[PDB]
């Protein structure tokens, strides 16, 4: 069934599963034409496919060339997603193929279902959580690699850097989703919080600063404060 | 003109023949239905005054033999049976008619309704959906489940409709995932018409037989089947012109004939709104759409 607050700990059991977020697959800028009409221009996008237990991220880069001469691109984007996720599963050795795939948007169920027909024992699931995976392009290193790509390309990352050496998956996922929720609500403030201190660096093989344990507490508190603030502004409360 | 005599009517029952029906009182001297038009299938069906559950009935064709009804006080239902002794049967039938204990199949001469609802239904096909090969007629009731239903318990009592499933390998060619799911032309025309049904008439025949089982017995899996077959056509961009015209006719008479008070369970809101308003064939069912709107604009 759908994934929600009740069955949240299932993400950290030993059943391999992946989240797929398609929100950054089909990205456009909207602009005016010489004649005064609106046109779009597509930029490179990415499928965000993430094992929430291990942090392994399969960042499939969607090169603008995919869209060339295609109609109904928003609808195609969902099938192209599903095609690429399916090929990702086929590429994995049997014992690594997921038992579940949780799609963050319900419109992905049928496209993925159809593309996964060869995998009847992989359960495709929706979720009721409002996960912030759309802010993934707010992670500087992920947006850089997407925007620089000149062809389709899969780039593998651990989205937890080395956190699991010291915390659990559950705590690692909660940090991840708090960082991304903040980036999503106020990117500028969020990034300020993360880099304000020049003496805390990002390792070349990491995405996030090398905070100590105490510095992460202060960070996480600052991110929570940011999120609560923005909420009263939006709603006047 | 053919006759289906009844031995007796021991229990108070509502008897239907095709779209007609008559109330019969316990031990009323009712002894058959006469003047049944040759050339079509027919269905006799029953609903006991004391159990408005389990509507049941028998598909038959009088060209395939002499059939009569007989109440079984052990199994508790009216059973269809074949009389092989042709002389003993004309005898029974003539005597009952002389004593005028038989109702006449009440066909208005202007009325093509039954023809229209059974145009493509052929007894030989029914007997492949309802497998009971020692009898030339087929029994169906309210509660019989379909082969598709069973997969998701007794096979001898199943309705072996052709399984249609839009999210199956059968329906979807590898490499044409998106194409085939959005445009079911290949599933309809190659897989189902050319492959399984062979022609449009057997397809339309199963579709009409499913509609009738839903209407007459409230058989839920038949309704599921009738709706699937409609949707398969409406969701194909490429359908022969002759199939579309005939479909609009088929559905028109089915919608026309449905009891008005049953439209809530027999009509699937999604399929109908998708077929009539969203599908490739939105503009190809002019009569079905006109009658649906003027009779059930609520469902839409």
Swiss-Prot record, chain A:
Region (RNase H homology domain): 7-237
Domain of life from the UniProt record: Eukaryota
Effect on the protein upon substituting residue 21 to N: Reduced growth at 30 degrees Celsius. Strongly reduced growth at 16 degrees Celsius
Entry's localization field: Nucleus
Effect of mutating residue 104 to A: Reduced growth at 30 degrees Celsius. Strongly reduced growth at 16 degrees Celsius
Outcome reported for the amino acid change (mutating residue 23 to A): Reduced growth at 30 degrees Celsius. Strongly reduced growth at 16 degrees Celsius
Domain notes: The MPN (JAB/Mov34) domain has structural similarity with deubiquitinating enzymes, but lacks the residues that would bind the catalytic metal ion.
Miscellaneous comment: Present with 468 molecules/cell in log phase SD medium.
Descriptive protein name: Pre-mRNA-splicing factor 8
Organism: Saccharomyces cerevisiae (strain ATCC 204508 / S288c) (Baker's yeast)
Residues of the full protein shown: 1836 to 2069 of 2413
From Swiss-Prot, chain B:
Modified residues (Phosphoserine): 236
Pfam families per UniProt: AAR2, AAR2_1st
A single Gene Ontology CC term: U5 snRNP
Effect recorded for residue 236 to A: No effect on interaction with PRP8
Keywords tagged on the record: Cytoplasm, mRNA processing, mRNA splicing, Nucleus, Phosphoprotein
Location in or out of the cell: Cytoplasm; Nucleus
InterPro entries: AAR2, AAR2_C, AAR2_C_sf, Aar2_N, AAR2_N_sf
Record keyword Cytoplasm present: yes
Keyword DNA repair: no
Post-translation changes: Phosphorylated on serine and tyrosine residues.
Region (Leucine-zipper): 244-265
Major place of residence: cytoplasm
Phosphothreonine PTM sites in chain numbering: 257
Superkingdom field: Eukaryota
CDD domains in the record: Aar2_C, Aar2_N
GO biological process, one term: spliceosomal tri-snRNP complex assembly
Consequence the record notes for mutating residue 236 to D/E: Disrupts interaction with PRP8
More info: Present with 7330 molecules/cell in log phase SD medium.
Homology family: Belongs to the AAR2 family.
Subunit structure: Heterodimer. Interacts with PRP8 (via RNase H homology domain and MPN domain), competing with BRR2 for the same binding site. Component of a U5 snRNP complex that contains at least the U5 snRNA, PRP8, SNU114, AAR2, SMB1, SMD1, SMD2, SMD3, SME1, SMX2 and SMX3, but is not a component of the U4/U6-U5 tri-snRNP complex.
Role summary: Component of the U5 snRNP complex that is required for spliceosome assembly and for pre-mRNA splicing. Involved in splicing pre-mRNA of the A1 cistron and other genes that are important for cell growth.
Protein name: A1 cistron-splicing factor AAR2
Organism, scientific name: Saccharomyces cerevisiae (strain ATCC 204508 / S288c) (Baker's yeast)
Gene designation: AAR2
């Amino acid at each position: 069934g759908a994934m929600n607050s009740s069955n949240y700990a299932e993400l950290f059991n030993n059943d391999i599963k992946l989240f797929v977020d398609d929100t950054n697959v089909y990205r456009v800028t909207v602009h005016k034409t010489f004649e005064g009409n609106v046109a779009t221009k597509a930029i490179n996008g990415c499928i965000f496919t993430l094992n929430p237990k291990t942090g392994h991220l399969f960042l499939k880069i969607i090169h603008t060339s995919v869209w060339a001469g295609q109609k109904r691109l928003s609808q195609l984007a969902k099938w192209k997603t599903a095609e690429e996720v399916s090929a990702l599963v086929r590429s994995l050795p049997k014992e690594e193929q997921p038992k579940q795939i949780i799609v963050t948007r319900k419109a992905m169920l049928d496209p993925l279902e159809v593309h996964m027909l060869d995998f009847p024992n992989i359960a495709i699931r929706p979720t009721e959580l409002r996960l912030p995976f759309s802010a993934a392009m707010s992670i500087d290193k992920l947006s850089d690699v997407v925007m620089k790509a000149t062809e389709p390309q899969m780039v593998l990352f651990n989205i937890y850097d080395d956190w699991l050496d010291r915390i659990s998956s559950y705590t690692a996922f909660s940090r991840l989703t708090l960082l991304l929720r903040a980036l999503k609500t106020n990117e500028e403030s969020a990034k300020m919080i993360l880099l304000s201190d020049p003496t805390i660096t990002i390792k070349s093989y990491h995405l996030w600063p090398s905070f100590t344990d105490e510095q992460w507490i202060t960070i996480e508190s600052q991110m929570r404060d940011l999120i609560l603030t923005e909420y009263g502004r939006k709603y006047n409360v | 003109m053919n006759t289906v005599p009844f031995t007796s009517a021991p229990i108070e029952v509502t008897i239907g023949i095709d779209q007609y029906s008559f109330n019969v009182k316990e031990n009323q001297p009712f002894h058959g239905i006469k003047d049944i038009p040759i050339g079509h299938v027919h269905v006799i069906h029953f609903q006991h005054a004391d159990n408005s559950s389990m509507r049941y009935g028998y598909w038959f064709d009088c060209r395939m033999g002499n059939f009569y009804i007989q109440y079984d006080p052990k199994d508790g239902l009216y059973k269809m049976m074949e009389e092989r002794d042709g002389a003993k049967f004309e005898n029974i039938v003539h005597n009952f008619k002389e004593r005028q204990m038989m109702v006449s199949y009440p066909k208005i001469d202007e009325d093509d309704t039954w023809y229209n609802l059974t145009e493509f239904v052929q007894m030989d096909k029914i007997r492949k959906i309802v497998r009971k090969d020692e009898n030339q007629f087929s029994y169906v009731d309210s509660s019989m489940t379909t082969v598709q239903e069973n997969e998701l318990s007794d096979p001898a009592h199943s309705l072996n409709y052709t399984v249609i499933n839009f999210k199956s390998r059968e329906a979807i060619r590898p490499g044409h995932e998106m194409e085939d799911f959005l445009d079911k032309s290949y599933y309809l025309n190659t897989v189902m018409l050319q492959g399984i049904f062979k022609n449009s008439s057997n397809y339309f025949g199963e579709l009409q037989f499913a509609f009738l089982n839903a209407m007459f017995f409230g058989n839920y899996g038949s309704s599921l089947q009738w709706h699937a077959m409609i949707e398969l056509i409406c969701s194909s961009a490429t359908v022969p012109k002759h199939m579309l015209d005939k479909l609009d006719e088929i559905l028109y008479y089915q919608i026309k004939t449905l009891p008005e008070q049953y439209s809530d369970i027999l009509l699937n809101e999604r399929v109908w709104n998708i077929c009539l308003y969203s599908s490739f064939q939105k503009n190809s069912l002019h009569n079905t759409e006109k009658i649906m709107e003027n009779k059930y604009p609520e469902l839409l």
